């Protein structure tokens, strides 16, 4: 069959970084993240983060040693970029909550550009490096104070990653929105208590910023790092979304998401066509996926469940078996969980 038909070698070199960097930016500054003085808020986002975007930049040094630095998980450049574009976009969501909830003041170009620089330094710190050990992420750190501008904490030894950015455009330590709790006598060593702390408040903001957007992510981490507690937490405090715990096995089949959705979903005809909604209104059924590298490769190499899963990513949508129909996506997002493949 090779030999049967055409071929065209796309290589990576096909895709520099800078193009891609051009797309989010245009991208970034036509259309709207909401569906206008927001757009305006994105355009000036743009024009500040753009020398940062720049060929031999701030990116395109960091995502190089990161490249040159280990992961958990197989890195890929573009997972590391869409990484960075969807947390950009919630920071500028960011911008735009705390300019909605100022009406008298709007946030003035200065301290947004203060804001921007900084997060976007955070923003590589743990989109690059989010899935290494820490002292790995610290090694990420150093080298982009070495090589950066932006102001960055004055700690002698804490990195920059357990800082965190406020909405007033200042490092500020990630230690002083912890709480502390005290849970009761007869419920220590619960499996429902979460005892916040240091990697717990950090864990909520991302998966908060992360699931805002509705990328679908995976957690990874050893076993016994309490992944699932972590996601539930933030599922559970997140309002109007619905958990749905999903163990997948080795032998899991996509069998399995269908019953799953029409347990839980109905099907409409709405005039573009069908289109898949969870019964109860204004949730988004979010799938837990508790194990989902599990399910055992085929002799081909391909994993259909997550070939399923990322069929409905990238279309938004997905086809019925029973009359050969497209179905769009509504409402519906995925979370996954993972011990590492080693
Ligand atoms: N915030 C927290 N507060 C209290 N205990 C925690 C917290 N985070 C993790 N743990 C501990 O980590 C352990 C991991 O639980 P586990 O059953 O292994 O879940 P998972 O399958 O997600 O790893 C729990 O028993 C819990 O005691």
Same mark, same amino acid.
């Given at each position: 069959?090779?030999?049967?038909?055409?071929?065209?070698?796309?290589?990576?070199?096909?895709?520099?970084?800078?193009?891609?960097?051009?797309?989010?930016?245009?991208?970034?500054?036509?259309?709207?993240?909401?569906?206008?003085?927001?757009?305006?808020?994105?355009?000036?986002?743009?024009?500040?983060?753009?020398?940062?975007?720049?060929?031999?930049?701030?990116?395109?040094?960091?995502?190089?040693?990161?490249?040159?630095?280990?992961?958990?998980?197989?890195?890929?450049?573009?997972?590391?970029?869409?990484?960075?574009?969807?947390?950009?976009?919630?920071?500028?969501?960011?911008?735009?909550?705390?300019?909605?909830?100022?009406?008298?003041?709007?946030?003035?170009?200065?301290?947004?550009?203060?804001?921007?620089?900084?997060?976007?330094?955070?923003?590589?710190?743990?989109?690059?490096?989010?899935?290494?050990?820490?002292?790995?992420?610290?090694?990420?750190?150093?080298?982009?104070?070495?090589?950066?501008?932006?102001?960055?904490?004055?700690?002698?030894?804490?990195?920059?990653?357990?800082?965190?950015?406020?909405?007033?455009?200042?490092?500020?330590?990630?230690?002083?929105?912890?709480?502390?709790?005290?849970?009761?006598?007869?419920?220590?060593?619960?499996?429902?208590?979460?005892?916040?702390?240091?990697?717990?408040?950090?864990?909520?903001?991302?998966?908060?910023?992360?699931?805002?957007?509705?990328?679908?992510? *995976?957690?990874?981490? +050893?076993?016994?790092? =309490? #992944?699932?507690?972590? !996601? &539930?937490?933030?599922?559970?405090? $997140? /309002? @109007? %979304?619905?958990?749905?715990?999903?163990?997948?096995?080795?032998?899991?089949?996509?069998?399995?998401?269908?019953?799953?959705?029409?347990?839980?979903?109905?099907?409409?005809?709405?005039?573009?066509? *069908?289109?898949?909604? +969870?019964?109860?209104? =204004? #949730?988004?059924?979010? !799938? &837990?996926?508790?194990?989902?590298? $599990? /399910? @055992? %490769?085929?002799?081909?190499?391909?994993?259909?469940?997550?070939?399923?899963?990322?069929?409905?990513?990238?279309?938004?949508?997905?086809?019925?078996?029973?009359?050969?129909?497209?179905?769009?996506?509504?409402?519906?997002?995925?979370?996954?969980?993972?011990?590492?493949?080693?």
């Amino acid at each position: 069959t090779v030999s049967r038909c055409g071929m065209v070698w796309f290589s990576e070199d096909v895709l520099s970084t800078d193009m891609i960097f051009n797309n989010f930016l245009a991208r970034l500054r036509s259309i709207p993240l909401d569906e206008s003085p927001m757009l305006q808020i994105q355009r000036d986002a743009a024009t500040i983060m753009q020398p940062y975007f720049t060929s031999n930049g701030l990116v395109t040094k960091a995502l190089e040693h990161a490249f040159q630095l280990e992961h958990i998980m197989d890195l890929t450049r573009l997972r590391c970029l869409g990484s960075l574009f969807s947390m950009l976009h919630q920071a500028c969501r960011n911008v735009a909550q705390y300019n909605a909830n100022h009406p008298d003041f709007p946030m003035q170009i200065e301290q947004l550009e203060r804001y921007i620089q900084r997060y976007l330094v955070y923003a590589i710190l743990w989109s690059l490096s989010g899935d290494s050990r820490l002292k790995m992420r610290a090694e990420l750190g150093e080298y982009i104070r070495r090589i950066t501008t932006v102001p960055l904490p004055t700690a002698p030894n804490i990195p920059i990653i357990d800082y965190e950015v406020s909405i007033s455009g200042e490092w500020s330590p990630w230690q002083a929105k912890v709480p502390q709790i005290e849970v009761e006598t007869h419920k220590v060593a619960a499996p429902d208590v979460v005892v916040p702390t240091l990697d717990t408040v950090r864990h909520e903001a991302l998966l908060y910023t992360w699931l805002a957007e509705h990328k679908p992510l *995976v957690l990874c981490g +050893p076993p016994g790092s =309490g #992944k699932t507690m972590t !996601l &539930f937490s933030a599922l559970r405090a $997140l /309002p @109007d %979304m619905e958990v749905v715990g999903l163990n997948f096995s080795s032998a899991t089949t996509p069998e399995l998401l269908l019953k799953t959705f029409d347990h839980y979903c109905e099907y409409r005809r709405t005039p573009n066509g *069908v289109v898949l909604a +969870p019964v109860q209104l =204004g #949730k988004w059924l979010v !799938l &837990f996926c508790d194990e989902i590298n $599990l /399910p @055992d %490769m085929d002799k081909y190499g391909t994993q259909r469940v997550i070939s399923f899963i990322r069929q409905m990513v990238e279309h938004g949508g997905f086809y019925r078996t029973s009359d050969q129909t497209w179905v769009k996506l509504e409402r519906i997002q995925f979370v996954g969980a993972c011990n590492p493949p080693t």
